[PDB]
Amino acid sequence: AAVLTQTPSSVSSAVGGTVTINCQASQSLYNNKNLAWYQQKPGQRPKLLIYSASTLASGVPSRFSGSGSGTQFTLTINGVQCDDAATYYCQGEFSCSSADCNAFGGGTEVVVKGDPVAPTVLIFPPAADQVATGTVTIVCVANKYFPDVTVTWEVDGTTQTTGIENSKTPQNSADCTYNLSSTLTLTSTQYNSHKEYTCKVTQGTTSVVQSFNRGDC
Amino acid sequence: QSLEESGGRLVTPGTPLTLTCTVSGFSLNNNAMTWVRQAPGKGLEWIGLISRSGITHYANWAKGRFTISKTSTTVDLKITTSTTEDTATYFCARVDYDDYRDWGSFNVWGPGTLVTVSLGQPKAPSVFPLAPCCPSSTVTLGCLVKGYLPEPVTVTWNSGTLTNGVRTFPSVRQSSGLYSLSSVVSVTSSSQPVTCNVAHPATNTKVDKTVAP
Amino acid sequence: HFPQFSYS
Helix, strand or coil: CCCEEEECCEEEEECCCEEEEEEEECCCCCCCCCEEEEEECCCCCCEEEEECCCEECCCCCCCEEEEEECCEEEEEEECCCHHHCEEEEEEEECCCCCCCCEEECCCEEEEEECCCECCEEEEECCCCCCHHHCEEEEEEEEEEEECCCEEEEEECCEECCCCEEEEECCCCCCCCCEEEEEEEEEEHHHHHCCCEEEEEEEECCEEEEEEEEHHHC | CEEEEECCCEECCCCCEEEEEEEECCCCCCCEEEEEEECCCCCEEEEEEECCCCCEEECCCCCCCEEEEECCCEEEEEECCCCHHHCEEEEEEEEEECCCCEEEEEEEECCCEEEEECCCCCECCEEEEECCCCCCCEEEEEEEEEEEECCCCEEEEHHHCCCCCEEECCCEECCCCCEEEEEEEEEECCCCCEEEEEEEHHHCEEEEEEECC | CCCHHHCC
Protein backbone atom coordinates (compact mmCIF):
# COMPACT_ATOMS: atom_id res chain seq x y z
CA ALA A 1 0.00 0.00 0.00
CA ALA A 2 0.86 3.69 -0.26
CA VAL A 3 0.15 6.46 2.23
CA LEU A 4 1.06 10.02 3.02
CA THR A 5 1.91 10.90 6.62
CA GLN A 6 0.99 14.54 7.09
CA THR A 7 2.29 16.51 10.04
CA PRO A 8 1.38 18.35 12.14
CA SER A 9 -2.30 17.48 12.59
CA SER A 10 -2.91 21.04 13.85
CA VAL A 11 -0.99 24.25 14.27
CA SER A 12 -1.71 27.82 15.39
CA SER A 13 0.15 30.79 13.85
CA ALA A 14 0.05 34.56 14.48
CA VAL A 15 -0.84 36.77 11.52
CA GLY A 16 2.35 37.39 9.59
CA GLY A 17 3.97 34.16 10.75
CA THR A 18 5.14 31.28 8.62
CA VAL A 19 3.57 27.83 8.60
CA THR A 20 5.23 24.80 6.99
CA ILE A 21 3.31 21.50 6.70
CA ASN A 22 5.06 18.21 5.97
CA CYS A 23 3.97 15.26 3.84
CA GLN A 24 6.03 12.05 3.92
CA ALA A 25 5.15 9.38 1.35
CA SER A 26 5.61 5.72 2.28
CA GLN A 27 6.91 5.01 -1.25
CA SER A 28 8.13 7.20 -4.15
CA LEU A 29 5.46 9.18 -6.01
CA TYR A 30 4.48 8.84 -9.62
CA ASN A 31 6.82 10.99 -11.72
CA ASN A 32 8.85 11.51 -8.50
CA LYS A 33 7.05 14.81 -7.77
CA ASN A 34 3.28 14.40 -8.27
CA LEU A 35 2.27 15.73 -4.85
CA ALA A 36 -0.49 18.32 -4.66
CA TRP A 37 -1.79 20.49 -1.84
CA TYR A 38 -5.39 21.55 -1.22
CA GLN A 39 -7.03 24.15 1.02
CA GLN A 40 -10.43 23.44 2.49
CA LYS A 41 -12.38 26.15 4.22
CA PRO A 42 -14.93 24.68 6.66
CA GLY A 43 -18.04 23.40 4.88
CA GLN A 44 -16.56 24.11 1.44
CA ARG A 45 -15.02 21.97 -1.29
CA PRO A 46 -11.23 21.50 -1.55
CA LYS A 47 -9.28 24.00 -3.65
CA LEU A 48 -6.02 23.14 -5.35
CA LEU A 49 -3.09 25.31 -4.19
CA ILE A 50 0.05 23.57 -5.48
CA TYR A 51 0.66 20.69 -7.88
CA SER A 52 3.76 18.86 -9.09
CA ALA A 53 5.25 19.63 -5.64
CA SER A 54 5.98 23.29 -6.39
CA THR A 55 3.70 24.73 -9.11
CA LEU A 56 1.24 27.37 -7.91
CA ALA A 57 -2.25 26.72 -9.22
CA SER A 58 -4.73 29.14 -10.69
CA GLY A 59 -6.09 31.78 -8.33
CA VAL A 60 -3.57 31.16 -5.55
CA PRO A 61 -1.71 33.99 -3.78
CA SER A 62 2.08 34.07 -3.90
CA ARG A 63 2.43 33.52 -0.13
CA PHE A 64 1.76 29.81 -0.79
CA SER A 65 4.70 27.70 -1.98
CA GLY A 66 5.64 24.05 -2.07
CA SER A 67 8.84 22.08 -2.25
CA GLY A 68 10.08 18.51 -2.27
CA SER A 69 10.78 15.41 -4.30
CA GLY A 70 10.78 11.66 -3.90
CA THR A 71 9.13 11.01 -0.51
CA GLN A 72 9.40 14.32 1.47
CA PHE A 73 7.27 17.33 0.56
CA THR A 74 6.31 20.59 2.20
CA LEU A 75 3.78 23.41 1.88
CA THR A 76 4.72 26.82 3.27
CA ILE A 77 2.47 29.79 3.94
CA ASN A 78 4.79 32.82 4.02
CA GLY A 79 3.01 35.51 6.03
CA VAL A 80 -0.20 33.89 7.18
CA GLN A 81 -3.43 35.90 7.03
CA CYS A 82 -6.74 35.37 8.80
CA ASP A 83 -8.23 34.05 5.55
CA ASP A 84 -5.69 31.18 5.67
CA ALA A 85 -7.54 29.55 8.62
CA ALA A 86 -8.47 26.27 6.97
CA THR A 87 -7.60 22.58 6.76
CA TYR A 88 -4.88 21.67 4.25
CA TYR A 89 -4.34 18.27 2.64
CA CYS A 90 -1.58 16.75 0.58
CA GLN A 91 -2.42 14.29 -2.17
CA GLY A 92 0.04 11.94 -3.84
CA GLU A 93 -0.21 10.02 -7.06
CA PHE A 94 1.37 6.57 -7.09
CA SER A 95 1.88 3.91 -9.72
CA CYS A 96 -1.53 2.23 -10.06
CA SER A 97 0.20 -1.09 -10.78
CA SER A 98 1.84 -1.21 -7.31
CA ALA A 99 -0.50 0.79 -5.04
CA ASP A 100 -3.66 2.78 -4.97
CA CYS A 101 -3.37 5.37 -7.72
CA ASN A 102 -3.93 8.26 -5.28
CA ALA A 103 -4.02 8.90 -1.55
CA PHE A 104 -4.46 11.89 0.76
CA GLY A 105 -2.58 12.93 3.85
CA GLY A 106 -4.63 13.15 7.03
CA GLY A 107 -4.86 16.96 6.96
CA THR A 108 -3.57 19.87 9.00
CA GLU A 109 -5.93 22.31 10.72
CA VAL A 110 -4.40 25.78 10.70
CA VAL A 111 -5.66 28.29 13.25
CA VAL A 112 -4.64 31.90 12.72
CA LYS A 113 -4.11 34.07 15.79
CA GLY A 114 -5.40 37.58 15.31
CA ASP A 115 -5.78 40.48 17.71
CA PRO A 116 -7.32 39.40 21.06
CA VAL A 117 -11.01 40.32 21.41
CA ALA A 118 -13.12 39.53 24.49
CA PRO A 119 -16.56 37.98 23.85
CA THR A 120 -19.91 39.47 24.56
CA VAL A 121 -22.61 36.96 25.51
CA LEU A 122 -26.32 36.53 24.79
CA ILE A 123 -28.81 34.07 26.31
CA PHE A 124 -32.10 33.02 24.69
CA PRO A 125 -34.87 31.53 26.87
CA PRO A 126 -37.04 28.85 25.19
CA ALA A 127 -39.86 29.86 22.89
CA ALA A 128 -43.22 29.36 24.59
CA ASP A 129 -44.11 26.37 22.35
CA GLN A 130 -41.03 24.31 23.28
CA VAL A 131 -42.10 23.14 26.73
CA ALA A 132 -45.19 21.24 25.45
CA THR A 133 -42.86 19.03 23.35
CA GLY A 134 -41.33 17.51 26.51
CA THR A 135 -37.88 19.03 25.88
CA VAL A 136 -36.52 22.57 26.36
CA THR A 137 -33.44 23.92 24.58
CA ILE A 138 -31.77 27.08 25.87
CA VAL A 139 -29.28 28.88 23.62
CA CYS A 140 -26.23 30.94 24.57
CA VAL A 141 -24.07 32.78 22.04
CA ALA A 142 -20.55 34.13 22.48
CA ASN A 143 -19.90 36.89 19.98
CA LYS A 144 -16.84 37.91 18.00
CA TYR A 145 -13.92 36.71 20.10
CA PHE A 146 -10.35 35.46 19.97
CA PRO A 147 -8.79 33.32 21.48
CA ASP A 148 -10.96 30.33 22.32
CA VAL A 149 -13.34 30.31 25.26
CA THR A 150 -14.84 27.64 27.49
CA VAL A 151 -18.54 27.65 28.28
CA THR A 152 -20.23 26.42 31.42
CA TRP A 153 -23.93 26.33 32.29
CA GLU A 154 -25.33 26.73 35.80
CA VAL A 155 -28.88 25.87 36.81
CA ASP A 156 -29.63 27.32 40.25
CA GLY A 157 -25.85 27.53 40.82
CA THR A 158 -25.06 23.90 39.86
CA THR A 159 -22.56 23.51 37.00
CA GLN A 160 -24.14 21.22 34.39
CA THR A 161 -22.25 18.06 33.32
CA THR A 162 -24.53 16.86 30.48
CA GLY A 163 -27.01 18.20 27.93
CA ILE A 164 -24.57 20.75 26.39
CA GLU A 165 -23.71 21.02 22.67
CA ASN A 166 -21.32 23.66 21.31
CA SER A 167 -20.84 24.87 17.76
CA LYS A 168 -18.21 27.37 16.62
CA THR A 169 -18.26 29.39 13.39
CA PRO A 170 -15.19 29.31 11.13
CA GLN A 171 -12.66 32.03 11.88
CA ASN A 172 -13.54 35.32 10.29
CA SER A 173 -11.50 35.91 7.13
CA ALA A 174 -10.76 39.56 8.04
CA ASP A 175 -10.14 39.53 11.81
CA CYS A 176 -9.73 35.83 12.81
CA THR A 177 -12.59 35.97 15.35
CA TYR A 178 -14.92 33.17 16.28
CA ASN A 179 -18.54 33.04 17.29
CA LEU A 180 -19.96 30.23 19.44
CA SER A 181 -23.36 28.76 20.15
CA SER A 182 -23.81 26.68 23.30
CA THR A 183 -27.10 24.88 23.77
CA LEU A 184 -28.43 23.30 27.00
CA THR A 185 -31.21 20.71 26.59
CA LEU A 186 -33.34 19.67 29.57
CA THR A 187 -36.62 17.84 29.99
CA SER A 188 -39.69 20.04 30.42
CA THR A 189 -39.98 18.67 33.97
CA GLN A 190 -36.38 19.66 34.72
CA TYR A 191 -36.85 23.09 33.15
CA ASN A 192 -40.11 23.80 35.03
CA SER A 193 -38.60 22.70 38.34
CA HIS A 194 -35.58 25.06 38.25
CA LYS A 195 -35.37 28.88 38.26
CA GLU A 196 -32.02 30.49 37.38
CA TYR A 197 -30.33 29.64 34.04
CA THR A 198 -26.79 30.98 33.57
CA CYS A 199 -24.37 30.80 30.65
CA LYS A 200 -20.76 31.55 31.68
CA VAL A 201 -18.14 32.18 28.98
CA THR A 202 -14.51 32.21 30.13
CA GLN A 203 -11.54 33.50 28.13
CA GLY A 204 -8.29 32.90 30.01
CA THR A 205 -9.25 34.05 33.54
CA THR A 206 -12.01 36.45 32.55
CA SER A 207 -15.63 35.32 32.62
CA VAL A 208 -18.66 36.96 31.07
CA VAL A 209 -22.09 35.81 32.28
CA GLN A 210 -25.70 36.09 31.11
CA SER A 211 -28.67 34.73 33.09
CA PHE A 212 -32.46 34.69 33.16
CA ASN A 213 -35.13 33.40 35.58
CA ARG A 214 -37.76 31.08 34.03
CA GLY A 215 -40.37 33.16 35.90
CA ASP A 216 -39.41 36.37 34.06
CA CYS A 217 -39.39 35.21 30.41
CA GLN B 1 -15.74 24.27 -16.14
CA SER B 2 -18.23 23.19 -13.43
CA LEU B 3 -19.30 20.04 -11.68
CA GLU B 4 -22.40 19.27 -9.64
CA GLU B 5 -22.98 16.15 -7.57
CA SER B 6 -26.46 14.82 -6.80
CA GLY B 7 -28.10 11.84 -5.13
CA GLY B 8 -27.07 12.33 -1.51
CA ARG B 9 -29.78 11.24 0.91
CA LEU B 10 -30.50 9.15 3.96
CA VAL B 11 -29.61 5.53 3.21
CA THR B 12 -30.62 2.47 5.25
CA PRO B 13 -27.54 0.36 6.11
CA GLY B 14 -27.22 -2.56 3.76
CA THR B 15 -28.90 -0.90 0.76
CA PRO B 16 -27.47 0.44 -2.50
CA LEU B 17 -26.92 4.06 -3.48
CA THR B 18 -26.19 5.80 -6.83
CA LEU B 19 -24.65 9.29 -6.97
CA THR B 20 -24.30 11.37 -10.14
CA CYS B 21 -21.86 14.11 -11.14
CA THR B 22 -23.13 16.33 -13.95
CA VAL B 23 -20.43 18.07 -15.95
CA SER B 24 -20.76 21.48 -17.63
CA GLY B 25 -18.25 22.99 -20.05
CA PHE B 26 -16.17 19.98 -21.12
CA SER B 27 -16.73 16.45 -22.35
CA LEU B 28 -15.73 13.36 -20.40
CA ASN B 29 -14.44 11.97 -23.67
CA ASN B 30 -11.46 14.29 -23.10
CA ASN B 31 -11.28 14.38 -19.26
CA ALA B 32 -10.73 11.78 -16.55
CA MET B 33 -12.87 12.07 -13.41
CA THR B 34 -12.52 10.92 -9.81
CA TRP B 35 -14.65 10.51 -6.70
CA VAL B 36 -13.39 11.56 -3.27
CA ARG B 37 -15.30 11.51 0.01
CA GLN B 38 -15.04 13.02 3.45
CA ALA B 39 -16.74 11.75 6.56
CA PRO B 40 -18.05 14.48 8.89
CA GLY B 41 -15.13 16.00 10.80
CA LYS B 42 -12.61 13.71 9.01
CA GLY B 43 -10.17 13.88 6.08
CA LEU B 44 -10.41 13.48 2.31
CA GLU B 45 -10.39 9.88 1.09
CA TRP B 46 -9.84 8.78 -2.50
CA ILE B 47 -12.39 6.30 -3.89
CA GLY B 48 -11.62 5.74 -7.56
CA LEU B 49 -11.44 7.27 -11.01
CA ILE B 50 -12.41 6.72 -14.63
CA SER B 51 -10.07 7.46 -17.52
CA ARG B 52 -11.04 9.15 -20.77
CA SER B 53 -11.43 5.79 -22.52
CA GLY B 54 -13.41 4.33 -19.61
CA ILE B 55 -10.72 2.47 -17.62
CA THR B 56 -11.61 2.39 -13.93
CA HIS B 57 -9.26 2.36 -10.96
CA TYR B 58 -10.34 1.97 -7.33
CA ALA B 59 -8.77 2.27 -3.94
CA ASN B 60 -8.15 -1.20 -2.52
CA TRP B 61 -10.57 -0.42 0.37
CA ALA B 62 -13.36 0.35 -2.18
CA LYS B 63 -12.83 -2.42 -4.74
CA GLY B 64 -15.87 -4.59 -5.26
CA ARG B 65 -18.32 -2.30 -3.41
CA PHE B 66 -18.01 0.89 -5.47
CA THR B 67 -18.53 1.10 -9.23
CA ILE B 68 -17.95 4.09 -11.52
CA SER B 69 -19.58 4.54 -14.92
CA LYS B 70 -20.00 7.53 -17.22
CA THR B 71 -21.53 9.18 -20.24
CA SER B 72 -19.91 12.11 -22.06
CA THR B 73 -21.60 14.55 -19.62
CA THR B 74 -22.12 12.58 -16.37
CA VAL B 75 -20.19 10.26 -14.12
CA ASP B 76 -21.85 7.98 -11.59
CA LEU B 77 -20.77 6.29 -8.35
CA LYS B 78 -22.74 3.21 -7.25
CA ILE B 79 -22.33 1.84 -3.74
CA THR B 80 -23.34 -1.86 -3.80
CA THR B 81 -24.12 -2.18 -0.10
CA SER B 82 -23.86 0.83 2.23
CA THR B 83 -22.77 0.97 5.91
CA THR B 84 -22.60 3.66 8.56
CA GLU B 85 -18.92 4.31 7.74
CA ASP B 86 -19.95 5.47 4.24
CA THR B 87 -21.59 8.55 5.76
CA ALA B 88 -19.74 11.36 4.02
CA THR B 89 -19.83 14.18 1.56
CA TYR B 90 -18.98 12.78 -1.88
CA PHE B 91 -17.16 15.03 -4.37
CA CYS B 92 -16.43 14.56 -8.02
CA ALA B 93 -13.34 16.14 -9.49
CA ARG B 94 -11.46 16.42 -12.76
CA VAL B 95 -8.16 14.53 -12.93
CA ASP B 96 -5.47 16.74 -14.44
CA TYR B 97 -3.62 14.92 -17.20
CA ASP B 98 -3.40 15.01 -20.99
CA ASP B 99 -1.58 12.94 -23.62
CA TYR B 100 1.75 14.66 -22.95
CA ARG B 101 1.99 14.85 -19.15
CA ASP B 102 0.21 13.92 -15.94
CA TRP B 103 0.08 16.78 -13.47
CA GLY B 104 -1.10 14.42 -10.72
CA SER B 105 -3.79 16.65 -9.24
CA PHE B 106 -7.57 17.04 -9.16
CA ASN B 107 -8.11 20.59 -10.36
CA VAL B 108 -11.90 21.11 -10.69
CA TRP B 109 -14.26 20.04 -7.86
CA GLY B 110 -18.01 19.98 -7.31
CA PRO B 111 -19.68 21.29 -4.12
CA GLY B 112 -20.30 17.75 -2.92
CA THR B 113 -23.42 15.76 -2.08
CA LEU B 114 -24.11 14.49 1.43
CA VAL B 115 -24.73 10.78 2.03
CA THR B 116 -26.12 9.74 5.43
CA VAL B 117 -26.07 6.00 6.09
CA SER B 118 -28.12 5.58 9.21
CA LEU B 119 -31.18 4.04 10.72
CA GLY B 120 -34.07 6.48 10.93
CA GLN B 121 -36.57 8.07 8.59
CA PRO B 122 -36.44 11.59 7.15
CA LYS B 123 -37.61 14.01 9.85
CA ALA B 124 -38.46 17.67 9.31
CA PRO B 125 -37.04 20.27 11.70
CA SER B 126 -38.90 21.98 14.48
CA VAL B 127 -38.23 25.73 14.25
CA PHE B 128 -38.42 27.95 17.33
CA PRO B 129 -37.80 31.70 17.61
CA LEU B 130 -34.87 33.04 19.63
CA ALA B 131 -35.34 36.37 21.36
CA PRO B 132 -34.00 37.93 24.59
CA CYS B 133 -35.87 37.90 27.83
CA CYS B 134 -37.91 41.13 28.14
CA PRO B 135 -36.54 48.56 24.27
CA SER B 136 -32.84 47.87 23.65
CA SER B 137 -31.20 49.73 20.75
CA THR B 138 -29.43 46.72 19.20
CA VAL B 139 -30.82 43.22 19.49
CA THR B 140 -29.95 39.76 18.29
CA LEU B 141 -32.82 37.53 17.20
CA GLY B 142 -32.73 34.05 15.71
CA CYS B 143 -34.23 30.66 14.96
CA LEU B 144 -33.38 27.33 16.54
CA VAL B 145 -33.72 24.51 14.00
CA LYS B 146 -34.03 21.29 15.98
CA GLY B 147 -34.49 17.55 15.44
CA TYR B 148 -34.03 17.00 11.69
CA LEU B 149 -32.63 14.10 9.66
CA PRO B 150 -30.68 14.00 7.33
CA GLU B 151 -28.65 17.10 6.78
CA PRO B 152 -28.84 19.59 5.20
CA VAL B 153 -31.20 22.37 6.02
CA THR B 154 -30.87 25.80 4.47
CA VAL B 155 -31.64 28.87 6.55
CA THR B 156 -32.19 32.27 4.98
CA TRP B 157 -33.50 35.52 6.38
CA ASN B 158 -36.15 37.61 4.63
CA SER B 159 -36.00 35.28 1.62
CA GLY B 160 -32.25 35.83 1.25
CA THR B 161 -32.42 39.66 1.10
CA LEU B 162 -31.21 40.05 4.72
CA THR B 163 -27.52 39.25 4.71
CA ASN B 164 -25.55 41.56 6.95
CA GLY B 165 -25.35 40.55 10.59
CA VAL B 166 -26.31 36.86 10.05
CA ARG B 167 -24.49 34.00 11.80
CA THR B 168 -25.67 30.48 10.99
CA PHE B 169 -23.78 28.01 13.16
CA PRO B 170 -22.57 24.61 11.96
CA SER B 171 -25.03 21.80 12.61
CA VAL B 172 -24.37 19.36 15.44
CA ARG B 173 -25.51 15.75 15.43
CA GLN B 174 -27.14 14.90 18.77
CA SER B 175 -26.67 11.53 20.46
CA SER B 176 -30.15 10.65 19.11
CA GLY B 177 -28.80 10.88 15.56
CA LEU B 178 -30.88 13.99 14.87
CA TYR B 179 -29.33 17.33 13.99
CA SER B 180 -29.76 20.85 15.33
CA LEU B 181 -28.49 24.34 14.54
CA SER B 182 -29.25 27.95 15.30
CA SER B 183 -29.11 31.00 13.08
CA VAL B 184 -28.99 34.51 14.54
CA VAL B 185 -29.24 37.99 13.09
CA SER B 186 -28.34 41.36 14.58
CA VAL B 187 -30.88 44.08 13.99
CA THR B 188 -31.60 47.44 15.60
CA SER B 189 -34.63 48.84 17.30
CA SER B 190 -35.72 50.65 14.11
CA SER B 191 -35.91 47.32 12.21
CA GLN B 192 -39.07 45.61 11.04
CA PRO B 193 -39.67 41.97 12.10
CA VAL B 194 -37.22 39.48 10.60
CA THR B 195 -38.27 36.14 9.13
CA CYS B 196 -36.14 33.00 9.07
CA ASN B 197 -36.86 30.65 6.15
CA VAL B 198 -35.96 27.05 6.94
CA ALA B 199 -35.87 24.54 4.08
CA HIS B 200 -35.37 20.80 4.50
CA PRO B 201 -35.12 19.22 1.03
CA ALA B 202 -35.30 15.64 2.35
CA THR B 203 -38.87 16.25 3.60
CA ASN B 204 -39.83 18.88 1.00
CA THR B 205 -40.56 21.28 3.86
CA LYS B 206 -40.21 25.04 4.08
CA VAL B 207 -41.11 26.83 7.31
CA ASP B 208 -41.04 30.54 8.12
CA LYS B 209 -40.83 32.07 11.61
CA THR B 210 -41.14 35.82 12.08
CA VAL B 211 -39.23 37.19 15.08
CA ALA B 212 -39.24 40.57 16.81
CA PRO B 213 -37.94 41.81 20.21
CA HIS C 1 1.90 2.81 -19.92
CA PHE C 2 0.89 6.48 -20.33
CA PRO C 3 -1.40 8.06 -19.24
CA GLN C 4 -1.18 5.40 -16.53
CA PHE C 5 -4.95 5.47 -15.93
CA SER C 6 -5.69 4.53 -19.57
CA TYR C 7 -4.38 0.88 -18.95
CA SER C 8 -5.85 -1.74 -16.64
